[PDB]
């Protein structure tokens, strides 16, 4: 007897997912008639000889060893309703012929014969013998069949290690991987799923003119860099070593995530700030429709209340903009409002306190930098400029003021001296930097641990490059706390010059290089060498969502010449290249949270403690919370790796893992290919350690470093991005204005009103959760694996993350932990694992989605 295997295809239309057609606006989704398909009878168009599916057997091979073929069969009727049919999805039924001889299906080929591509989500088979239902999760765009030599193949639910591949599917598995790799030539087309590497020869535009040229980041000892996804474009005409610029930056097709709500297309929203808002805003400044400058602090505060009064003309073209509707509020006509940033929702003035300044190094936008001070004076790593032979000029006499009354030696002994050091990367470029419109210092802040457990700043060292040459060291001045008179204002100016350094390092290193840039060679290596079926592919896959897409954007628009990062932040046109010089010190294994903590002296290893380490400041929120998160990931990654791999030998026998990690190392981070610290793939503990660092980086680290951007920085007074004026000197007229009107002096020193609007527009988006976000650990999409052991393991991650959330909230209810809240009363929630959509100050995503 023949039997018919009963089949269920779930796909989504492009019109349901594509920005241009989803361009109405969207505000509530997970709904509609939870899009039935059915309704609006255009589903009938999938139903002739339009799309064919062809089952592939996993138990029966042909003469040359490959799985037997089913007979190409077309979609047969429209399925209106299914218990799991989600919003915007459409369902089609299709019955395949099989027998007691075509075996157990473990794969299928698919052919779109229609004009338009569609996102196939899943296929489900309801079977024949003593075999349960087979689920296939596809999640991949299917373009017209004419574009492919070998038809689109998908595999079932079952997780297989390469040894565990069913013999009839071994060639198919390997052959997909081959198709994914490519040959490293050609221009990469929209419809392609081809994964490879290039250097960042990408960011500059020397055909527009030589001042638009940027250096090649990567491939070299001066400017080493992580690789980025390969695009195929022609060389620029002027420099054959750079790639020509395009509006249209390729990433492998399935890496670009479509959306159901239009408000959720944040990259388009970001491309819209730079290409539509910026020039229309520019206009209004350049002609004379808004004042060029802020005059008082209340004028900055007026951006959240009354907004920026703008002509109806230009407001008419920035307010029907698709995504940007959710980030701009319009009262009617002359108004462009920003949401109250969470740093001012209680106190407007509290940002200026010394407690908040010191505290935001433990718990703000960049809570990752501070060092425990172990000797004195603090020394430089810099070379032949003479202060890594000399030092800091902050002195023992500067440091003995008010609080305890111990010596600086004794302050170091008892672990109560700490350091924000922003001297070494920005010094060597500082002379160049200061010869643009930027006026900046290379800074140092020495912080004291007080009795209540809070941090208090005790000295700020402001350094300028060279009276008489680089071989002459630094010229440095030193500024002490004062809360009275003109001295108070000089001090608040001295904090502005530190924060400005910090904004910059944060954006290029703590944010861009440490998450975004660095995760990319990992995504490429995984797709080139780990099959969709592979266990580690499935572990690591959620942690990659939309990442190549936002990096493809940033290359076109954030990290490019004259881009937002360049226009906005302290290092200017030197930003991305200085970030590469810092990457010379990037060590993968030091990106593990305990390693980072111990290295910066903020933790020490103690096997009598909660996580086997002990903090030297208890109330270092970022880090007590981070540590809870780190251990949850590393426990999850340990149960998951150790589920699949019985021995270290099974790992060394795993040729997919081995080739993947080889390519990561020798190619993806190939400028670090001889570094002694890379985990070999010799040991299961090494795979756990690297899988935990990939996930930490892409989820929790990216979140701690990213979602606190608009809440802390949406107030430009709190996190300025550029200083454009040196400190007022005693005799000068700038000094009498500092006396007379210090708010005006503050403002002429920081980011101008125009770039502030750009900076606020950018980070407001960068701090938003898209509705359709998939957060840490509670979350994936459907039936990812039929291996219930892994599924159980994942549930234990979710439960523990949930338990951690209650425990973190508990800590923000604690008035004893002062550093969690500040004078600004902003609970530290940036590591709370779950979130709603929007500009929340919380929610850890699986990946770098923005
Ligand atoms: Fe980001």
Concatenated DSSP letters of 312-351: HHHHHHHSS-TTTTTT-B-SSSS--B-PPPGGGSS-SSGG
Tell me the H-state helices in 447-517: 485-505
Whichever domain contains 190, its CATH number is 4.10.375.10
| Residue 218, both tokens | 């990567």
Distance CA 339, CA 592 (A): 35
Residues 28 and 149 in one domain: yes
Q: Are residues 237 and 265 in the same domain?
A: no
Q: Which one, of 76, 67, 81, 66, lies nearest residue 5 by Cα? A: 76
Instruction: Tell me: is residue 259 an annotated ligand-binding position.
Output: no
Neighbour tally for 54: CB within 10 Å: 18
Q: Two tokens at 376?
A: 């004195």
Q: Is residue 850 annotated as part of the catalytic site, yes or no?
A: yes
CA 363/CA 815 separation, integer angstroms: 16
Q: How far apart are CA 9 and CA 91, in angstroms?
A: 6
CATH of the domain at 443: 3.10.450.60
As a whole number of angstroms, the distance between CA 481 and CA 447 comes to 11
Contact assessment for residue 500 and residue 722, using Cβ atoms and an 8 Å cutoff: yes
Q: What is the DSSP string of 768-816?
A: PBPTT--BTTT--SS---S-HHHHHHHHHHHHHHHHHHHHHHHHHT-TT
179 is in an annotated binding site: no
* Main-chain phi, psi angles of 791, to 5 degrees: -60, -40
Smallest Cα–Cα separation from 566: which of 577, 551, 580?
577
284 in the same domain as 252: no
CA-atom Rg of the chain in angstroms: 28
Report yes or no: 321 and 410 within 8 Å, Cβ to Cβ: no
Q: Among the options 611, 638, 702, 769, which is catalytic?
A: 702
Ligand 1 centroid from CA 70, angstroms:
45
Q: Of 135, 212, 511, 769, which is the active-site residue?
A: 511
Task: Please choose, from the candidates 662, 502, 548, 39, the residue with its C-alpha nearest in 3D space to the C-alpha of residue 256.
Answer: 548
Listed in sequence order, the residues at least 6 apart from 815 whose beta carbon sits closer than 8 Å to its beta carbon are none
CA–centroid distance, residue 409 to ligand 1 (Å): 40
Tokens coding 234: 């022609």
Confirm if 549 and 257 have CB atoms less than 8 A apart. Answer: yes
Question: Would you state the structure tokens that stand for residue 615, as one six-digit string?
Answer: 């903090």
Q: Is 516 annotated as a binding residue?
A: yes
Contact present, 826 and 361 (Cβ < 8 Å): no
- Which residues are near ligand 1, the ion (C-beta closer than 5 Å)? 706
Question: If you write DSSP's letter for every residue of 601-668 in order, what string do you get?
Answer: TSEEE-TTSTTSEEESSS--HHHHHHHHHHHHHHHHHHHHHHHH-SSHHHHHH-HHHHHHHHHIIIII
Residue 849 Cα to ligand 1 midpoint, Å, equals 7
For residue 321, what are the CA distances in angstroms to 17, 20, 248, 469?
Answer: 18, 12, 20, 51
Catalytic residue among 112, 157, 706, 846: 706
**β-sheet bridge partners, residue 446:** 419, 459
3-state secondary structure of 835: coil
Q: Report the candidate in 171, 124, 119, 123 with the shortest Cα–Cα distance to residue 150.
A: 171
First and final C-alpha spacing in the chain: 55
Q: In sequence order, which residues have a C-beta less than 8 Å from that of residue 20 and are 6 or more positions away?
A: none
To the nearest 10°, the Cα dihedral for 353, 354, 358, 360? 10
**638 catalytically annotated:** no
- What is the sign of the dihedral through the CA atoms of 306, 312, 314 and 318? positive
Instruction: Tell me which of 222, 240, 260 is where a domain ends.
Output: 260
Ligand 1 centroid to residue 709 C-alpha, Å:
10
Ligand 1 midpoint to CA 239 (Å):
30
Cβ contacts of 605 within 8 Å, gap of 6 or more: 594, 598, 612, 613, 614
Task: Tell me how crowded residue 466 is: count the other CB atoms within 10 A of its CB.
Answer: 15
d(CA 547, CA 196): 15
Q: Is 210 exposed, middle or buried (0-12, 13-18, 19+ CB in 10 A)?
A: exposed
- Within 10 angstroms of residue 364's Cβ, the number of other Cβ atoms is 30
Same domain, yes or no: 478 and 516: no
Query: What was the structure determination method?
Result: X-ray
Ligand 1 centroid to Cα of residue 839, in Å, is: 14
Residues 242 and 266 in one domain: no
User: What's the CATH code of the domain at 308?
Assistant: 4.10.372.10
Place of tokens 């032979």: 389
595 vs 623: CA distance, rounded Å: 12
H or E stretch including 56? strand 51-61
What is the phi-psi region of residue 209: left when phi exceeds 0, alpha when psi lies from -120 to 50, beta otherwise? left
Count CB atoms within 10 A of the CB of residue 847: 28
Query: What is the domain extent for residue 330?
Result: 261-349
The answer to whether 543 is a known catalytic residue is no
Q: What is the number of other CB atoms lying within 10 angstroms of the CB of residue 307?
A: 17
Query: Quick one: which of 493, 519, 846, 510 has its CA closest to 709?
Result: 510
Distances (CA, A) of 241 to 209, 451, 457: 15, 57, 47
Distance CA 6, CA 105 (A): 12
State the distance from the centre of ligand 1 to the C-alpha of 549, rounded, in angstroms: 11
**Which residue, 560, 395, 555, 572, is CA-closest to 500?**
572
How many residues belong to the chain?
850
Residue 786 C-alpha from the chain's centroid: 30
- The reply to whether omega before 377 is within 30° of 0 (cis) is yes
User: How far are the Cα atoms of 68, 700, 779 from residue 846, in angstroms, in the given order?
Assistant: 38, 8, 8
d(CA 790, CA 785): 8
User: From CA 19, how far away is CA 661, in angstroms rounded?
Assistant: 36
Taking the C-alpha atoms of residue 559 and residue 580, their distance in angstroms, rounded to an integer, is 12
State whether 14 and 153 are in the same domain. Answer: yes
Distance 540 CA to ligand 1 centre (A): 18
Respond yes or no: is residue 611 known to be catalytic. Answer: no
- Does 509 lie in the same domain as 632? yes
702 annotated among ligand-binding-site residues: yes
- Nearest-angstrom CA–CA distance, 181 and 197: 10
B/e letters for 270-299, b = 16+ CB within 10 Å, e = fewer, are bbbbbeebbebbeebbeeeebeeebeebee
Distance of CA 134 to the CA centre of its chain: 35
Separation CA 749–CA 565 (nearest Å): 19
Domain count, the chain: 5
Residue with tokens 């241009």: 20
Do 688 and 829 have their domain in common? yes
Instruction: Give the Å distance between the CA of 507 and the centre of ligand 1.
Output: 9
The H or E element containing residue 53 is strand 51-61
C-alpha distance from residue 495 to each of 463, 546, 710, 814 (Å): 13, 36, 19, 29
Residue 299 backbone zone (phi > 0: left; psi -120 to 50: alpha; other: beta) = alpha
CATH of the domain at 10: 2.60.60.20
Residues contacting residue 794 through CB under 8 Å, at least 6 positions apart = 636, 640, 777, 780
Cα of 41 vs its chain's centroid, Å: 40
Q: Identify the helix (H) or strand (E) that includes residue 419.
A: strand 417-422
Q: Is 135 a catalytic residue?
A: no
Q: Which residues, 6+ apart, have CB-to-CB distance to 842 below 8 Å? A: 707, 829, 830, 831, 832, 834, 835
CA–CA distance, 556 with 831 (Å, rounded to integer): 30
29 contacts: CB under 8 Å, gap ≥ 6 = 87, 88, 260, 261, 771, 772
The domain boundary residue, chosen from 314, 349, 384 = 349
Strands (E), 566-656: 603-605, 613-615
Which tokens is 136 given? 């296939």
**Backbone torsion region of residue 40, taken as left when φ is above 0, otherwise alpha when ψ lies between -120 and 50, otherwise beta:** left
Find out whether 694 is annotated in a ligand binding site: no
The CATH number of whichever domain residue 526 belongs to comes to: 1.20.245.10
Maximal CA-CA distance, the chain: 102
3-state class (DSSP) for residue 478: strand
Residues ≥6 apart with Cβ < 8 Å to 665: 672, 673, 678
Is residue 144 located within the same domain as residue 179?
Answer: no
Q: Are 769 and 546 in contact (CB under 8 A)?
A: no
Can you tell me the distance from the alpha carbon of 465 to that of 730, in angstroms, rounded to the nearest whole number?
Answer: 21
Which pair of tokens denotes residue 359?
Answer: 């505290």
Whether residue 696 sits in one domain with residue 800: yes
* Claim to verify: residue 197 and residue 76 sit in the same structural domain: no
Distance (Å) from CA 850 to ligand 1 centroid: 4
Residue showing tokens 């969207």: 26
CA distances from 517 to 44, 583, 666, 669, 708 (A): 44, 10, 17, 11, 20
3-state helix, strand, coil in the chain (%, to 5): 40, 15, 50
Q: Give 698 Cα–ligand 1 centroid separation in angstroms.
A: 9
Domain termination residue (choose one: 428, 455, 483): 483
Specify the DSSP class assigned to residue 509.
I
User: Are 273 and 285 members of one domain?
Assistant: yes
Q: Give the residue carrying structure tokens 């239009």.
A: 262
Please answer whether residues 671 and 523 qualify as being in contact, where contact means their C-beta atoms are separated by less than 8 angstroms: no
The span from the CA of 682 to the CA of 358, in Å, is: 43
């Amino acid at each position: 007897r023949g039997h018919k295997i009963k089949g269920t295809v779930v796909l989504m239309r492009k019109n349901v997912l594509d920005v241009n057609s989803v361009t109405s606006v969207g505000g509530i989704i997970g709904q509609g008639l939870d899009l039935v398909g059915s309704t609006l009878d255009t589903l009938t168009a999938f139903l002739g000889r339009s799309v064919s599916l062809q089952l592939i057997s996993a138990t029966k091979a042909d003469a040359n060893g490959k799985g037997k073929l089913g007979k190409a069969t077309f979609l047969e009727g429209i399925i209106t309703s299914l218990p799991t049919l989600g919003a915007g999805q459409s369902a089609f039924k299709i019955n395949f012929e099989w027998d007691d001889g075509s075996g157990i299906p473990g794969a299928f080929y698919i052919k779109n014969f229609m004009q338009t591509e569609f996102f196939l989500v899943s296929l489900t088979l309801e079977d024949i013998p003593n075999h349960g239902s087979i689920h296939f999760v596809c999640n991949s765009w299917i373009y017209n069949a004419k574009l492919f030599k070998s038809d689109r193949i998908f595999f079932a639910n079952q997780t297989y290690l390469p040894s565990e591949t069913p013999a009839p599917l071994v060639k198919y598995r390997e052959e997909e991987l081959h198709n994914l790799r490519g040959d490293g030539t050609g221009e990469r087309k929209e419809w392609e799923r081809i994964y490879d590497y290039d250097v960042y020869n990408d960011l500059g535009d020397p055909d527009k003119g030589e001042n638009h040229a940027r250096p090649v980041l990567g491939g070299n000892d001066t400017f080493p860099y992580p690789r980025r996804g390969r695009t195929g474009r022609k060389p620029t005409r002027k420099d054959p070593n750079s790639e020509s610029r395009s509006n249209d930056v390729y990433l492998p097709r399935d890496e670009a995530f479509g959306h159901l709500k239009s408000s959720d297309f944040l990259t388009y929203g970001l491309k819209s700030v730079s290409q539509n808002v910026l020039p229309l805003l520019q206009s209004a400044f350049d002609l004379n429709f808004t004042p060029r400058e802020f005059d008082s602090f209340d004028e900055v505060h007026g951006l959240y209340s009354g907004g920026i009064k703008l002509p109806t003309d230009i407001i008419s073209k920035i307010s029907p903009l698709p995504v940007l509707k959710e980030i701009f509020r319009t009262d009617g006509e002359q108004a462009l409002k920003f949401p109250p940033p969470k740093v001012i929702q209680v106190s407007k003035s509290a940002w200026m306190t010394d407690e908040e300044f010191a505290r935001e190094m433990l718990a703000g936008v960049n809570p990752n930098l501070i060092r425990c001070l172990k000797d004195f004076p603090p020394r430089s790593k810099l070379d032949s400029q003479v202060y890594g032979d000399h030092t800091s000029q902050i002195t023992k006499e500067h440091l003995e003021p008010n609080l305890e009354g111990l010596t600086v030696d004794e302050a170091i002994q008892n672990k109560r001296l700490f350091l924000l050091d922003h001297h070494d990367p920005i010094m060597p470029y500082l002379r160049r930097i200061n010869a643009t419109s930027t006026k900046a210092y290379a800074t140092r802040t020495i912080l004291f641990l007080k009795n209540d457990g809070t941090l208090r700043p005790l000295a700020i060292e402001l350094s300028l490059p060279h009276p008489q040459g680089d071989q002459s060291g630094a010229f440095s001045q030193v500024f002490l706390p004062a809360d009275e008179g003109v001295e108070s204002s000089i001090w608040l100016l001295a904090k502005a010059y530190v924060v400005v350094n910090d904004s910059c390092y944060h954006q290029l290193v703590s944010h861009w290089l440490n998450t975004h840039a660095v995760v990319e060679p990992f995504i490429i290596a995984t797709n080139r060498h780990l099959s969709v079926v592979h266990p580690i592919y499935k572990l690591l896959h959620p942690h990659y969502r939309d990442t190549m897409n936002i990096n493809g954007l940033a290359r076109l628009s954030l990290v490019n010449d004259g881009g937002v990062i360049e226009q906005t932040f302290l290092w200017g046109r030197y930003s991305v290249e200085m970030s590469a010089v810092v990457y010379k010190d990037w060590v993968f294994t030091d990106q593990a949270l305990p390693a980072d903590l111990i290295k910066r002296g903020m933790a020490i290893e103690d096997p009598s403690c909660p996580h086997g380490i002990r903090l030297v400041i208890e109330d270092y929120p970022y880090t007590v919370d981070g540590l809870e998160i780190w251990d949850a990931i590393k426990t999850w990654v340990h149960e998951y790796v150790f589920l699949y791999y019985k021995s270290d030998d099974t790992l060394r026998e795993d040729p997919e893992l081995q080739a993947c990690w080889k390519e990561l190392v020798e190619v993806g981070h190939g400028d670090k290919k001889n570094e002694p610290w890379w985990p070999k793939m010799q040991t299961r503990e090494e795979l756990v350690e690297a899988c935990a660092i990939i996930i930490w980086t892409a989820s929790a680290l990216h979140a701690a470093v990213n979602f606190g951007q608009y809440p802390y920085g949406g107030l430009i007074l709190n996190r300025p991005t550029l200083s454009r004026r040196f400190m007022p000197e005693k005799g000068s007229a700038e000094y009498e204005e500092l006396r007379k009107n210090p708010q005006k002096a503050y403002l002429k020193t920081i980011t101008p009103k125009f770039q502030t609007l750009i900076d606020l527009s950018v980070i407001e988006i960068l701090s938003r959760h898209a509705s359709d976000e998939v957060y840490l650990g509670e979350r994936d999409n459907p039936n990812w694996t039929s291996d219930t052991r892994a599924l159980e393991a994942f549930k234990r991650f979710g439960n523990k993350l949930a338990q951690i959330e209650n425990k973190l909230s508990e800590r923000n209810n604690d008035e004893k932990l002062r550093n969690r809240c500040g004078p600004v009363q902003m609970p530290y929630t940036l590591l709370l694992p779950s979130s709603k959509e929007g500009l929340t100050f919380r929610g850890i995503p699986n990946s770098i989605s923005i």
